[PDB]
Subunit: 33 residues, 3 copies
């Protein structure tokens, strides 16, 4: 279970960091977005 | 603790998937967004 | 490991809640966004 949680948490961390980047681009109008 | 973590992780997974959908719609201008 | 997971999960929860707020603002055009 723990090793399974660890793997899912790290997938979520990647996903969330990609979302933060995309959301900041939308919020700031980076590159016409 | 582990069962508690498992439950919170799965809530985060739902949330993140809904955020990805919304962000992709904003990024692609789906349906006028 | 468990205490480590707990800490990362709670960071993700903060992050996701901030993302939901920002995304809702973009989706609703709150405050010109």
């Amino acid at each position: 279970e723990v090793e399974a949680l660890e793997k899912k948490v790290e997938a979520l961390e990647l996903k969330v960091q990609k979302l933060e980047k995309k959301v900041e681009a939308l919020e700031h109008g980076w590159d016409g977005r």
